[PDB]
Write a protein that binds this DNA or RNA. Structure first.
Ligand SMILES: [Mg+2]
Ligand SMILES: [Mg+2]
Ligand SMILES: [Mg+2]
Ligand SMILES: [Mg+2]
Ligand SMILES: [Mg+2]
Ligand SMILES: [Mg+2]
Ligand SMILES: [Mg+2]
Ligand SMILES: [Mg+2]
Ligand SMILES: [Mg+2]
Ligand SMILES: [Mg+2]
Ligand SMILES: [Mg+2]
Ligand SMILES: [Mg+2]
Ligand SMILES: [Mg+2]
Ligand SMILES: [Mg+2]
Ligand SMILES: [Mg+2]
Ligand SMILES: [Mg+2]
Ligand SMILES: [Mg+2]
Ligand SMILES: [Mg+2]
Ligand SMILES: [Mg+2]
Ligand SMILES: [Mg+2]
Ligand SMILES: [Mg+2]
Ligand SMILES: [Mg+2]
Ligand SMILES: [Mg+2]
Ligand SMILES: [Mg+2]
Ligand SMILES: [Mg+2]
Ligand SMILES: [Mg+2]
Ligand SMILES: [Mg+2]
Ligand SMILES: [Mg+2]
Ligand SMILES: [Mg+2]
Ligand SMILES: [Mg+2]
Ligand SMILES: [Mg+2]
Ligand SMILES: [Mg+2]
Ligand SMILES: [Mg+2]
Ligand SMILES: [Mg+2]
Ligand SMILES: [Mg+2]
Ligand SMILES: [Mg+2]
Ligand SMILES: [Mg+2]
Ligand SMILES: [Mg+2]
Ligand SMILES: [Mg+2]
Ligand SMILES: [Mg+2]
Ligand SMILES: [Mg+2]
Ligand SMILES: [Mg+2]
Ligand SMILES: [Mg+2]
Ligand SMILES: [Mg+2]
Ligand SMILES: [Mg+2]
Ligand SMILES: [Mg+2]
Ligand SMILES: [Mg+2]
Ligand SMILES: [Mg+2]
Ligand SMILES: [Mg+2]
Ligand SMILES: [Mg+2]
Ligand SMILES: [Mg+2]
Ligand SMILES: [Mg+2]
Ligand SMILES: [Mg+2]
Ligand SMILES: [Mg+2]
Ligand SMILES: [Mg+2]
Ligand SMILES: [Mg+2]
Ligand SMILES: [Mg+2]
Ligand SMILES: [Mg+2]
Ligand SMILES: [Mg+2]
Ligand SMILES: [Mg+2]
Ligand SMILES: [Mg+2]
Ligand SMILES: [Mg+2]
Ligand SMILES: [Mg+2]
Ligand SMILES: [Mg+2]
Ligand SMILES: [Mg+2]
Ligand SMILES: [Mg+2]
Ligand SMILES: [Mg+2]
Ligand SMILES: [Mg+2]
Ligand SMILES: [Mg+2]
Ligand SMILES: [Mg+2]
Ligand SMILES: [Mg+2]
Ligand SMILES: [Mg+2]
Ligand SMILES: [Mg+2]
Ligand SMILES: [Mg+2]
Ligand SMILES: [Mg+2]
Ligand SMILES: [Mg+2]
Ligand SMILES: [Mg+2]
Ligand SMILES: [Mg+2]
Ligand SMILES: [Mg+2]
Ligand SMILES: [Mg+2]
Ligand SMILES: [Mg+2]
Ligand SMILES: [Mg+2]
Ligand SMILES: [Mg+2]
Ligand SMILES: [Mg+2]
Ligand SMILES: [Mg+2]
Ligand SMILES: [Mg+2]
Ligand SMILES: [Mg+2]
Ligand SMILES: [Mg+2]
Ligand SMILES: [Mg+2]
Ligand SMILES: [Mg+2]
Ligand SMILES: [Mg+2]
Ligand SMILES: [Mg+2]
Ligand SMILES: [Mg+2]
Ligand SMILES: [Mg+2]
Ligand SMILES: [Mg+2]
Ligand SMILES: [Mg+2]
Ligand SMILES: [Mg+2]
Length: 245
RNA sequence: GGGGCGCACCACCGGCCCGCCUCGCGACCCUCCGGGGGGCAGGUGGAGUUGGAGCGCGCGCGAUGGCACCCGAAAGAUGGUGAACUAUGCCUGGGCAGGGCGAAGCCAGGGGAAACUCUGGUGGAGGCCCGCCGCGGUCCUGACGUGCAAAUCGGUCGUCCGACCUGGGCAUAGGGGCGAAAGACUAAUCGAACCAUCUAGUAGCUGGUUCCCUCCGAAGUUUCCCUCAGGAUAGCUGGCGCUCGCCGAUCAAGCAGUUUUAUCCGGUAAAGCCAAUGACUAGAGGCACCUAUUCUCAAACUUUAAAUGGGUAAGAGGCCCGGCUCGCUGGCGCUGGAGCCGGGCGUGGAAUGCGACGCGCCUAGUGGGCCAUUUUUGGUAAGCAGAACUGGUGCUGCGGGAUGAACCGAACGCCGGGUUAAGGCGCCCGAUGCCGACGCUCAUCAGACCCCAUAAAAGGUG
RNA sequence: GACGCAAACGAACCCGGAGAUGCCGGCGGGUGCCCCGGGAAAGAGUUCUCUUUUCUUUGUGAAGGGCAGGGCGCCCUGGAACGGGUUCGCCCCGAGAGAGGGGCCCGCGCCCUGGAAAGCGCCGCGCUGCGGCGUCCGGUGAGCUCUCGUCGGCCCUUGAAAAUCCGGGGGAGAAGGUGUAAAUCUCGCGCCGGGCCGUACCCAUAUCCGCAGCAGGUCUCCAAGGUGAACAGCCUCUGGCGUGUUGGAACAAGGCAGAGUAAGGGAAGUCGGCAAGUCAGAUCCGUAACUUCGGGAUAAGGAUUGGCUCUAAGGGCU
RNA sequence: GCAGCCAGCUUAGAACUGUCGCGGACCAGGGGAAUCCGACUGUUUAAUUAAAACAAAGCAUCGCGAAGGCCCUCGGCGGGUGUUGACGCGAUGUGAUUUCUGCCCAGUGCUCUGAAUGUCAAAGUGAAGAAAUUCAACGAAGCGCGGGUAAACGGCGGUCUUAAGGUAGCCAAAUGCCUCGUCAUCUAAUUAGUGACGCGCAUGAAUGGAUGAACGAGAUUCCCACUGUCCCUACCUGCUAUCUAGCGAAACCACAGCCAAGGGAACGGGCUUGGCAGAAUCAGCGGGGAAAGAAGACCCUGUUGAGCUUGACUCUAGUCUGGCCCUGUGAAGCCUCACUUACCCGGUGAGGCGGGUUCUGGCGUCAAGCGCCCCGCGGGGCGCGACCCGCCCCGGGGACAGCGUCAGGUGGGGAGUUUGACUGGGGCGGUACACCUGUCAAACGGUAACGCAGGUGUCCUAAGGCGAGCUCAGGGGGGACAGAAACCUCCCGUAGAGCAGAAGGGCAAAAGCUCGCUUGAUCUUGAUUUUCAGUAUGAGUACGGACCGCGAAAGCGGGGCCUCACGAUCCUUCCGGCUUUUGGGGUUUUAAGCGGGAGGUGUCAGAAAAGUUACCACAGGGAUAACUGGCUUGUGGCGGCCAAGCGUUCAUAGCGACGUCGCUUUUUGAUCCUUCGAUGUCGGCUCUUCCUAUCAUUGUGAAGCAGAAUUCACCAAGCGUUGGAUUGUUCACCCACUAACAGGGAACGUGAGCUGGGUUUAGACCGUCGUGAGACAGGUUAGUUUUACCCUACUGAUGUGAGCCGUUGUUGCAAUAGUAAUCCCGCUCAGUACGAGAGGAACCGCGGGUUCAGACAUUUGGUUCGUGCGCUUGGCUGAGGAGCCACUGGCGCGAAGCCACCAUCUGC
């Protein structure tokens, strides 16, 4: 047979992301002295739309403490923030929606967003629209804090991980049922070339292990092992269970 | 007319050498620690030996490895070149009459006790409608179909603000790409592009394989083979000889797809079942059976038993006699037996024919056969399928059967004369143009000769 | 006050602007074109009859100055309910309407410099270039384009970067000591320079690709009059052209096309209403089953349609 | 409060008016009632499939928190997703909405455990041994075991029964073979359509079920309207064809080109026997040249491929896991926890590490200030402001990730290869593939077929060897229980029993039975028979040499009474040998070798081996299938003979049982002779001729013929044999009509004649089947039908006896060839014959018609580019007038021509 569609996406020729009109990488201000021993005052300049994501981005303007300059940061817009408000980032920052402060300095049950997975990575978790992370518990002895991720998973992270207080703006985006295939065309035209998905049963055996036969049946158990080779790992990869549930 | 030395070669019997086996095991001069010998004999294995024949060169042919007689694949591999077509994506540009339905929003006026409703207008939303350009390509299965065109033309038709159309610049490259998925597209090439090379790839498979004359002349069968379109092998074929015989007296041997004589072998035809095994019909007698009869049968039944056929023997390699040898055999060195040696006796002791189809070596082709009389299996039968003997044919023309592969006659250098075969002799068309013999036969579908080109049961006061 | 003055020092560094923002709809301003009236001038066409007629020509570059016109969430005064202003739609208003008076931007429109000297039109003379006259005055529009605006609509779509240029913040610095100096973004003026490469032509029913002068393919710009809803079809002007690799003569069969026509019947043809026939535009009426209430729908089914002569209504301006 | 002036363009109404004509040209939806499928728009096989296929929104599941999921790369812990972060990315299924989505976790697969008993690599560990080595313990992942999971693949039965037994629904469906199901409806008639019925060959619930507005160049049925689709064709125009001037190919070609029969490679053009036969040509035409185009694409074969799939064979990338390696340090009880410096990751312009500014959508830029010091009031430096020290920039991991290297598992993701043969084509079946008996087999031997009837891959320490004794099968007479069969006994008993087995042979003091002694079923050499090449192996025979058994002995026995019961090389294994080598010697292990067994190749002289291809390819094959033709005629069809019987009686008016003889090639087979470098394949349409086994008509005979009607038979193919519904249909069935609605042939006539409905490429759907790719001889939908100008034949059209007193013309003759008419009705006969009636003819005569033939245009109708006349739309020449343009602008009428059973005439 030939190389299946799923394998051709790793070479990245026509499957690369469409990043022409994107405004930049949304990430927290990198950890410095002002965020380890205090807070820095930042003004929200504009809340812009990032092509490819349903979550708006805030252009928060900060002031460089070592040189006379104004640092422009592209944060994940927390739902509720607005242009003209002051966003405070640091250890001594107050618990307000939009502020950035470590998880160790926030009480249990605090709803946060743009949460750092490791101290300094400038935000990795809870970045999509309407999502958030809850601070479950703390541990001052080990300086570790337990948080709840939007997938229901509970991860033990460091207490120095910075996060934005609040929920990511643009919530409820998946609640509007797309009606036209054209709206799905434009939805993925800004993200990547992945929208029109031909079924493997609708192909020939040369390009998919589910194709072929005088009917469009799968023919083989759709649940495939995890150690299956690339080109065979299609269907339900390492499915623990199936059915309506 | 007698004797003899006997070449080469062949048959047989020995001797010896090496391997192996069995038997015999012993005292002894080579033991000098260790050890080497000890007629050993009787068998058997060996590509040995018993008075070398090879080596080199050349020539011819055969079977091989090689491009291997020539041309031919579908492929496989290595390296490379293409996204000017097209597929998708990216970037930056360009483009899409006039109408139709007419949503939210808004205005005003009616109805109502209120909740609120009703009407008109406005408004201009939509993968909305008609439709031009554009982009597509439904039907006519129209035109065309060596065309205008290696996909075009006409009318008709789909869509025509959207998942729209489109340029340029970019990206993805061959087991890779790309694919709203047709195995589609990737430069007229796609169920794996193109180019060059490996490569003159291999082919048990088609095709072709070049001058003459002369001579000889097949096989389609055996066994084996992942064989059954091929090979190996035997047979059939040719060539090369050679050993002789005739020369030197059918001298005689020897031989034979043939008889004769003698001697065996067989279980088929026929026959038989009142004989066995099995099948089967009918009465009859006796105290369903039992006895004597009876009808009808066998390929896997048979007492009996041919024709044709198979083997063997028809002499000097015989016959007769004597002596000798033996470890085998044993009442009996003659009891067997066999071997060795010598002597005696042609009236070569059936017919016919023939030089020995003698002894070798090398060897091509073939290993699809087909047909006829007879025999014979399966089948309703077949110009069917499968066997047996022989001939034919393939390979073969000629006379005849009009015609023809195979029937009939007869096989062939180039001719003249003669005469025939099979078949014919009204005319075509050589030959009855006989005063041919006797009879049969009338058909309003007559009849007219192997194979052979169809005719039956049953009928006629012809 | 918005902001204006020919200029009107100023670095490092910082901030911001322009470059630099999609598609669609409505409306408005301006050109171009088209159209109407001059009983307008200059030639021309017709003049059998009629036609104060028909046709053609009646213009001004860049840049600069001035002024219409358009735009402005720009300013000042002031204060709104009996709310008012206002658009086709909307929208706007004590975060300040209306009104009054200003300011700014765009002005591709008009006038002027250019610049009538040139260009067109007409007439005249000369020859084998010189002169004359004219180049005028208006009307409009559901008109068509282009463009500048404005207000919206749409997106689970938000519709580029950079070179370059500019403003501000900054006040580090520079300048002279009584008339000048430093400094000058003064289209105030003068002086000098701007190299290299492409540039013809075809651009398609004969200059490209398809082997060709191939009915194929190949990205754009400009675009008139009449009919009409139309960038439809049909006709005409400007421009182009000889009918698309040949002529002549016949008009048989059989073809291809004209989607030619055909009495009576009307799908009996045929696998099958294949084929083309019917219907068709517009106006006025009338529109079911079913439904996701959106539709179905131009459902279906009707009537009307010419020409001519009138009536009525729908405007603007002083 | 308007008067004056200016400015258009629409709308409504009315009169009048022409031939009731007017969106006059042009432009420009036929409609309705239903079924199926897909929701829709969109997309798709460039060059045969625009679709019901793909996509789609929606729905659902799966994976994954980044040291990650998915994927790329030869490789860098490089790259894509990712300028991403679960409202995300990645992998699948289903396919809008509505309505539901049942049961099954046994199987397969996925996944989760590890109170995990097994299986279990490398390394490490222990023991034995001179050591190589052997043995043992230990023993990861995975497997096994256990649980979960079906919107995972899939499945969802006849008291039996499993894993669940098809639930809601739906249906003779795009799914039902039987089948053209049954009923209803739709029509005169319906294999169609629709609605029902459902044990449904073989429906069914996200392999989604049911429904469904809107939509569709989708499939189907009906109705209205409409029409040349047809009845039934005709006329006109343009461009051609045609002729001409100029110009000027190609395909194709053994030679060629009249037929009938014959035979032949079984369908000649040439050959045979006949018919016969006259230059040179034109326009047509499509019968033939088994016409051309193309080394059949179907089929088979080849030890030729390729695409693709799996539970094929053998590997492999990746991945999982273990050991070693970078890999060090500290502590505690191999394991755990710590250490940082290896290594790894993250952040940053490496900007503050360790120890001692929240009151606003301002502003913040190289230090003010102070202290100290140096230049000649201008100038400069330094320090504090801005604390000191420090060894690693700051975080997060950490000797774990990860790299390297072996080891185990997984691995159709990928690679390579295979997937027997025989065979009345192949496949399926079977084994005729290695053997044995009888027969075939034709009296030596041998002798074939997918001939016949059978057997074999064993069995036996005796069922081998030997000796002795005994006699069997069966029948009869008898004899307590005891009988048709228990046991005793007598007589008869050629074997008719038994001998392991198939059958044949052989066997009576044996070869059978019984008994007691045994291991000749042992060890060896060669010869030899059978199969045979006269090779091997297997299976036999006769000996010789050993050592034995049994018997008193002669003797018998080296397996089975005989004919069957079996296996090369290589390798492994075992046994045997004072006997070899282990090589520079010696010793000892090991290894090798020699001799003999065993381990096995059943395709049995012995490869290690699953499919599919309708996406297919190549070399070939008429050695071999699917057509026609040929042979044959079982079968099908048709006709006889005999005469039991039927016919009230009466065999034979008409029939014909049991039997039997034929014919025919319009059935189907059998065969495989022709054709695979191709003979175009079903049906219909069209058109011609032929056969008679005669439906009708003509002339007859017969009757269980009164008439009428009908039946049987004869001469006889002259003439006719229809229009429709359904189905692609030949074949059926029905509706009507009719004198009758007879059956056939001609390559199962006829595709360069047509039409493609069907079959029979590639698209796609359903059901069943298969794990799958795929299959269906099941259904369904869409799917390029190319070329003639050559030679004949035929159709017409020119011309033709090259020699002559012939040339030329008129009127004619005529061989030969073609040939043509046909059937019906009405009146009359006549309500008559006939008959009891009911009913009910015929000849002559008369008047018409059907089908056909040949004409013809007076009439009617059609056509009209005489572009003849009128009218008229848009435009154009200024207008009138007169005209033109729109490939014939349109409309009405229309001459002449041509033309219609749509008008007319004639047919012996
Ligand atoms: Mg895509
Ligand atoms: Mg999806
Ligand atoms: Mg899909
Ligand atoms: Mg497909
Ligand atoms: Mg499949
Ligand atoms: Mg599906
Ligand atoms: Mg499916
Ligand atoms: Mg001698
Ligand atoms: Mg290969
Ligand atoms: Mg593209
Ligand atoms: Mg169009
Ligand atoms: Mg077309
Ligand atoms: Mg269609
Ligand atoms: Mg059609
Ligand atoms: Mg066509
Ligand atoms: Mg043609
Ligand atoms: Mg482009
Ligand atoms: Mg390739
Ligand atoms: Mg396919
Ligand atoms: Mg060669
Ligand atoms: Mg051959
Ligand atoms: Mg030979
Ligand atoms: Mg041979
Ligand atoms: Mg035969
Ligand atoms: Mg011969
Ligand atoms: Mg001969
Ligand atoms: Mg003859
Ligand atoms: Mg003769
Ligand atoms: Mg008779
Ligand atoms: Mg300043
Ligand atoms: Mg606008
Ligand atoms: Mg400044
Ligand atoms: Mg130029
Ligand atoms: Mg062209
Ligand atoms: Mg116009
Ligand atoms: Mg235009
Ligand atoms: Mg127009
Ligand atoms: Mg011309
Ligand atoms: Mg031309
Ligand atoms: Mg017509
Ligand atoms: Mg008509
Ligand atoms: Mg019909
Ligand atoms: Mg019909
Ligand atoms: Mg049609
Ligand atoms: Mg309707
Ligand atoms: Mg669709
Ligand atoms: Mg649906
Ligand atoms: Mg569509
Ligand atoms: Mg196509
Ligand atoms: Mg379509
Ligand atoms: Mg589908
Ligand atoms: Mg749904
Ligand atoms: Mg599923
Ligand atoms: Mg399970
Ligand atoms: Mg299945
Ligand atoms: Mg049920
Ligand atoms: Mg019908
Ligand atoms: Mg039904
Ligand atoms: Mg099912
Ligand atoms: Mg289910
Ligand atoms: Mg199903
Ligand atoms: Mg469609
Ligand atoms: Mg011929
Ligand atoms: Mg040919
Ligand atoms: Mg071939
Ligand atoms: Mg073979
Ligand atoms: Mg292969
Ligand atoms: Mg392939
Ligand atoms: Mg494979
Ligand atoms: Mg075979
Ligand atoms: Mg014999
Ligand atoms: Mg034996
Ligand atoms: Mg060893
Ligand atoms: Mg074999
Ligand atoms: Mg043959
Ligand atoms: Mg019969
Ligand atoms: Mg009787
Ligand atoms: Mg009978
Ligand atoms: Mg042909
Ligand atoms: Mg041929
Ligand atoms: Mg032919
Ligand atoms: Mg007859
Ligand atoms: Mg009779
Ligand atoms: Mg026939
Ligand atoms: Mg035929
Ligand atoms: Mg034909
Ligand atoms: Mg054809
Ligand atoms: Mg046909
Ligand atoms: Mg078809
Ligand atoms: Mg198909
Ligand atoms: Mg079809
Ligand atoms: Mg189609
Ligand atoms: Mg007339
Ligand atoms: Mg007019
Ligand atoms: Mg006029
Ligand atoms: Mg016209
Ligand atoms: Mg007329």
């Amino acid at each position: 047979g030939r190389v299946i569609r799923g394998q051709r996406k790793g070479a990245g020729s026509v499957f690369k992301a469409h990043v022409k009109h994107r405004k930049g990488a949304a990430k927290l201000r990198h950890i410095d002295f002002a965020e380890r021993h205090g807070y820095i005052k930042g003004i929200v300049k504009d809340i812009i739309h990032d092509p490819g994501r349903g979550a708006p981005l805030a252009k928060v303007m900060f002031r460089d403490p070592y040189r006379f300059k104004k640092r422009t940061e592209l944060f994940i817009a927390a739902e509720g923030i607005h242009t003209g408000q002051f966003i405070y980032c640091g250890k001594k920052a107050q618990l307000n929606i939009g502020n950035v402060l470590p998880v160790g300095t926030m009480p249990e049950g605090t709803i946060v967003c743009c949460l750092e997975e490791k101290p300094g990575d400038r935000g990795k978790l809870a970045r999509a629209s309407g999502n958030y992370a809850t601070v479950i518990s703390h541990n001052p002895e080990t300086k570790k804090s337990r948080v709840k991720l939007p997938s229901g998973s509970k991860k033990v992270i460091s207490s120095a991980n910075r996060a934005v207080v609040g929920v990511v703006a643009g919530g409820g985006r998946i609640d509007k049922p797309i009606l036209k295939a054209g709206r799905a065309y434009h939805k993925y035209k800004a993200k990547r070339n992945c929208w029109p998905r031909v079924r493997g049963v609708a192909m020939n055996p040369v390009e998919h292990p589910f194709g072929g036969g005088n009917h469009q049946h799968i023919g083989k158990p759709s649940t495939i092992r995890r150690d299956a080779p690339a080109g065979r790992k299609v269907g339900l990869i390492a499915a623990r269970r199936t059915g309506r549930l």
